[PDB]
Structure 1
Amino acid sequence: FSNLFARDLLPAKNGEEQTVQFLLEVVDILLNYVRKTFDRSTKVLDFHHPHQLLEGMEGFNLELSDHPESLEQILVDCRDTLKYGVRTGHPRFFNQLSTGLDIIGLAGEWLTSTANTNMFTYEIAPVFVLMEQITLKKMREIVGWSSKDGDGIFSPGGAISNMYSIMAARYKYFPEVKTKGMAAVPKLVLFTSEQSHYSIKKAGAALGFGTDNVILIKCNERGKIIPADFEAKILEAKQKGYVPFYVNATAGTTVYGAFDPIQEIADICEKYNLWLHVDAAWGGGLLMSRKHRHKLNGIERANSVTWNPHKMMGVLLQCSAILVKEKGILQGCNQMHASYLFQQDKHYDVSYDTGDKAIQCGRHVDIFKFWLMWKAKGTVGFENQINKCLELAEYLYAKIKNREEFEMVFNGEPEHTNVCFWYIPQSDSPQRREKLHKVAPKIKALMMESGTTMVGYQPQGDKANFFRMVISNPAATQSDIDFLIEEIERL
């Protein structure tokens, strides 16, 4: 393969056998990495600063040329890429909300890439289009919505699913904006928690509302929206002659893992006529658990829901859906031409085509890996896996609730797998907060140098840099949590 090039593989005539050997060579590298991902002897990452890779590692050239490299150099390039990347499936990877490597998911991804099609029409993605309609119906059933209505679409990340929801609310109340622009209607105000995902502020900016019109709702000790602050903010907007029309309730915040009081928010929405969107990008996996779905009570009253199977459900990146209670809103919002005008020429039912309801034109197949994982595990498989991660987080919290070297960020029992805490060097004082702020980056830097484990840290409001442990990986066990809690104390 050191004398063989890409030009030689299929489509080149007679390239069938070399293509299979090449792909089986690639798969051998992938398998060894898969085998090592579940092996605790392997580092989570072999850390290197950007300059150390740009200057090039011992035989790893990132630069591009006019000349093709050989098939053996391609295999070497593949091995090196994996050698210097992060093991996101590692049982000790706790850096992100998305962690682990589902084997069914990976098999699903591999098939999807082989099928290499576009979601935008039933014409070229028949099976995937049907699978999406099926899955989005089930997701809506689990949310608690009646089948009398309901819609949705998979989007390239929860940030875009959130964007869709704002576009949907605005079109429902102010369809004049699509044709005439945001200046053709009154000042529109939208509400979100002070601890919600920054995607609400970005969609506000992108969509023409201005971030000044994205109002932050005060949070209590446990990082949950105070309903009386939300109601007060609505009336302040109305008193100013502005139009409040949307609220993002976060079901499982990125940092504390808090759940907003959906029911108390929905009661206020009913009363003042606001779209209720629920960002369950992180909390959504708990809907699969009969034990934990109560944290999302009220979600059945929501107008839309963002849900990321790629977070707690362990679907490989990206897998995000926006569910909309009222069908026809995404279509009316996004259609650049009405109807049913695509017919009666076409060989198939064009109402299956999603180009018109999407902000995207071309769209990646994200459904197959998720549909496949649902077939392989069942709703019961997701249920038990989510419950295990939540039990592990209950364990970590109880092990460090009063430990000397550890201090809890907020007063409350975790609602999700998020456990927020500081590592105390010895010790409230403003000078102490300045000292404490430097503890987590220091340990994190050392964690990256060691490659033993990965955990995120971040400040919040006036609170100093604090560790935020999160659990979404089926491979993470009690011993790994013990190792991580001992690794923080050791460093």
Structure 2
Amino acid sequence: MEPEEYRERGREMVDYICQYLSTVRERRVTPDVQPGYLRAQLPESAPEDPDSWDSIFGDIERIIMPGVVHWQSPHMHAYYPALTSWPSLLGDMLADAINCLGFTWASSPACTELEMNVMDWLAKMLGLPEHFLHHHPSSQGGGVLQSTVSESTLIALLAARKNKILEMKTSEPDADESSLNARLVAYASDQAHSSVEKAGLISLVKMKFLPVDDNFSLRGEALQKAIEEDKQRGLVPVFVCATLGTTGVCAFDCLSELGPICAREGLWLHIDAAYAGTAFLCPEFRGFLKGIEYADSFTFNPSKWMMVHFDCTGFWVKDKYKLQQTFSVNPVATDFMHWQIPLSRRFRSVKLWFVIRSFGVKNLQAHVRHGTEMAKYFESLVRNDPSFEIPAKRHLGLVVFRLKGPNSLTENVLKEIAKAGRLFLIPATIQDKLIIRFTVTSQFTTRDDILRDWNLIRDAATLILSQ
């Protein structure tokens, strides 16, 4: 295609996107396809000659959309949100056209410098300590963009185990790094995201999952007991992942208790705030952050609730030296290749910059407040209905609930709802109880959307209960 055709096709794609995102409520959120559905609808080989743009573009509706889960539907209520926005789109359009790589400052200065200044903006927006700012005079720390919280959590564990091994190796300098690694133990809540287990599996570091209280919250007592038990057995506590907004029921570990324990015992304290971190834009949701001064690292996903399209993860460290010694064989700008697993990285900071500036802080805060109010409204509808119960507290955009009685009633409600797929729910379990997780997603979700989805859930319960 010629540049003049790109100008026409770009317009067709902008007009397509505007219509798609505007009318998304009309779509079946979940596709009704079987595994392998696509192969028989595609040629077995790449085309030798150009396919026409009418043919490629045609295939969006004809064969892509029928297999898509519409993550931007107000009726998507599974997992946690992953929200796009107009500004996000426009910013990545620019980054993808420049298509520079920013492994070093030198390889494209703007790619590193915009990211450095925007991560300082974002740390301030979240109410993070000044020691996570690149530009605070006394700081040895800073923020860097990653693709996922999963990888940011793995990097934190990699930095914690490398740091501790280098300190152990000064005493046993004939001892293999890998042998010293055998003695380490890392902790999280039994509510922690599967990425914590997976970071242990990848790093070959022992991971212990600790019991929680009645609010599904990891407490200092449980960490202190595990540390004493594990040191008595010759293990070397190295790392704690404290979760702010667990995946299951959006619970919060008790940072004010875990912080001092991590500081006194020499454990790297990493905060996984993947979903909930966006709420810290609002001063009234910062109570969960109490104890943040003890953190060695902090991560959240703008790519969940802050209307930046995926990939966009914020990762902040107190000590960029400890991070860089993980990733370089020898220990106002920076080469971000030493703050991450790969070499290459792209100009992800444009889309984050455009979202922050297009909305401004007040409209980002209004979005968080609105989504939370939509979840509160949903909650009030459940709480009013004595057929249902709510087995965990709602703090943000996630309500969990179930029909009173055996798990099978809730199982059968989810099955009935999945038949038409007008809203997308996935089950979880908390201890013995099957629950429905209801995540408020789209920034455009209205009270009418919430009542519409509640009424479908109620119709299904009425069907299952009336037999």
Q: TM-score of the superposition, structure 2-length normalised? A: 0.89
Residue in 1 aligned with 2:179? Answer: 183
SS at match of 1:50: coil
Equivalent in 437, 453, 456 of residue 423 of structure 2:
453
Aligned residue for 2:304, secondary structure, equals: coil
Q: Deviations over 1:32-65 (max 9, x none)?
A: 323323xx33433442223443333xxxx26433
In structure 2, relative to structure 1, the CA distance for the partners of 1:166 and 1:177 (3 Å cut) is farther
Structure 1 CA distance, aligned partners of 2:217 and 2:94? 41
Counterparts of 1:184 and 1:229 in 2: how far apart (Å)? 25
**Residue aligning to 1:341:** none
Q: Is the 8 A contact 1:277 1:305 kept in 2?
A: yes
SS of equivalent to 1:292: helix
User: Are 1:487 and 2:456 matched, yes or no?
Assistant: yes
1:93 aligns with one of 76, 98, 105: 76
Aligned residues of 1:255 and 1:418 also touching (Cα < 8 A): no
Deviates more, 1:329-338 or 1:307-316: 329-338
Query: Do the aligned partners of 1:290 and 1:383 also contact (CA within 8 Å) in 2?
Result: no
Corresponding residue number in structure 2 for 1:305: 298
1:160 aligns with 2:151: yes
Quote the Cα distance in structure 1 between the aligned partners of 2:426 and 2:182.
41
- The answer to whether the Cα contact below 8 Å between 1:386 and 1:472 also exists between their aligned partners in 2 is no
In 1, are the aligned partners of 2:83 and 2:305 still within 8 Å (CA)?
Answer: no
For residues 182 and 479 of structure 1, do their structure 2 counterparts lie closer, same or farther at Cα, with a shift above 3 Å needed?
same
Q: For 1:370, give the aligned amino acid.
A: L
State the Cα distance separating 1:186 from its structure 2 match. Answer: 5.7
Is the deviation greater in 86-95 or in 317-326?
86-95
Deviation at 1:155, TM superposition (A): 1.4
2:336 aligned with 1:354 = yes
| Structure 2 contact 371–397 (Cα < 8 Å) conserved | yes
Q: Measure, in 2, the Cα distance between the counterparts of 1:390 and 1:264.
A: 27
Do structure 1's residue 403 and structure 2's residue 385 form an aligned pair?
yes
Shift of 1:203: 0.7
Aligned to 2:402, which of 422, 427, 442?
422
Partner of 1:5: none
Counterpart Cα distance in 1 of 2:89 and 2:450: 25
- CA separation in 1, counterparts of 2:77 and 2:394? 16
Kindly provide the CA deviation profile for residues 182-236 of structure 1, in whole angstroms up to 9, marking residues without a partner as x. 2135610111000011111111110121xxx211111122211132111100101
Specify whether residues 442 and 288 from structure 1 end up closer, same or farther in structure 2 by C-alpha distance, changes over 3 A only: same
Q: How does 1:190-209 map to 2 (within 5 A)?
A: 190-209=186-205
1:241-273: CA deviation from partner (whole Å, max 9, x where unpaired): 110121111011111111111011102112222
Counterparts of 2:403 and 2:340, CA distance in 1? 45
How far apart, in 1, do the equivalents of 2:181 and 2:423 lie? 52
2:90 to 100, 107, 112: 107
Change beyond 3 A, Cα 1:177–1:357: farther
Q: Tell me the CA shift for residue 356 of structure 1.
A: 2.5
Taking the aligned partners of 2:163 and 2:37, their CA distance within structure 1 comes to: 52
Q: Which amino acid in the other structure matches residue 149 of structure 2?
A: G
Q: Please give the alpha-carbon distance, in whole angstroms, between the structure 1 residues aligned to 2:168 and 2:418.
A: 48
- Paired residues of 1:191 and 1:247 also in contact (CA < 8 A): yes
Once the 2 structures are TM-superposed, how far is the Cα of residue 386 of structure 1 from its aligned partner?
Answer: 0.6
- Structure 1 residue aligned with 2:20, among 29, 33, 47? 33
Query: How many corresponding residue pairs?
Result: 445
Cα shift at 1:444: 4.3
Deviates more, 1:24-33 or 1:106-115: 24-33
**CA distance change for structure 1 residues 183 and 28 in 2, over 3 Å: closer, same or farther?**
same
In structure 2, relative to structure 1, the CA distance for the partners of 1:62 and 1:143 (3 Å cut) is: farther
Q: Distance in 2 between matches of 1:474 and 1:336?
A: 45
Q: Summarize the alignment of residues 205-284 of structure 1 with structure 2, pairs less than 5 Å apart.
A: 205-209=201-205, 213-284=206-277
Q: 1:322 aligns with which of 312, 315, 318?
A: 315
- 1:119-130 equivalences in 2 (<5 Å): 119-130=102-113
Deviations 1:395-438, CA, capped at 9 Å, x for gaps:
2222212512312233xx312221111145xx4xxxx34x3463
- Whole-angstrom distance in 1 between the partners of 2:62 and 2:98: 27
SS in 2 for 1:174: helix
1:439 Cα offset (Å) = 2.4
- Tell me whether 124-133 or 174-183 shows the greater mean CA deviation: 174-183
Distance change (3 Å), C-alpha of 1:185 and 1:86 = closer
Query: Residue 218 of structure 2 aligns to a residue in which SS?
Result: coil
Partners of 2:302 and 2:312 within 8 A in 1: yes
| Matched AA of 1:385 | H
C-alpha distance in structure 2 between counterparts of 1:42 and 1:438, whole Å: 24
Amino acid at match of 1:33: Y
* Change in 2 beyond 3 A, CA 1:177/1:369: farther
* 1:9-29 residue CA offsets vs partner (Å, 9 max, x unmatched): 2xxxxx332332333333333
Displacement of 1:106 after TM fit? 1.6
Shift of 1:161: 0.5
1:364 alignment partner AA: R
Structure 1, 28-37 or 223-232: larger mean CA deviation: 28-37
1:217–1:226: 8 Å Cα contact kept in structure 2? no
- Partner SS for 1:268: helix
Partners of 1:188 and 1:243 within 8 A in 2: yes
Secondary structure of 1:421's aligned partner:
strand
More deviation, 476-485/114-123: 114-123
- Cα RMSD of the aligned pairs, angstroms, is 2.3
Instruction: Give the match's secondary structure for 2:38.
Output: helix
Q: Which residue of the partner structure matches residue 48 of structure 1?
A: 33
Q: Show the counterpart of 2:463.
A: none
The residue correspondences of 1:2-13 to structure 2 (distance < 5 A) are 9=1
Q: Which amino acid aligns with 2:412?
A: V
Mapped contact 1:250–1:278 kept (Cα < 8 A) = yes
Change (3 A) 1:99 1:480: farther
1:288 is the counterpart of 2:288: no
1:277 Cα shift? 0.9
Would the aligned equivalents of 2:417 and 2:456 in 1 still touch at CA under 8 Å?
A: no
Cα drift, residue 98 of structure 1: 2.3
Q: Secondary structure at the match of 2:453?
A: helix
The structure carrying a bigger helix percent of its residues is 2
Partner of 2:347: 365
Aligned equivalents of 2:376, 2:13: Cα separation in 1: 40
2:11 equivalent in structure 1: 24
1:382-401 counterparts in 2 under 5 A?
382-401=364-383
Q: TM-score by structure 1 length? A: 0.85
Work out the CA distance in 1 between the residues paired with 2:181 and 2:427: 42
d(CA) in 2 for partners of 1:408 and 1:336? 51
Distance 1:121 1:176 in 2: 29
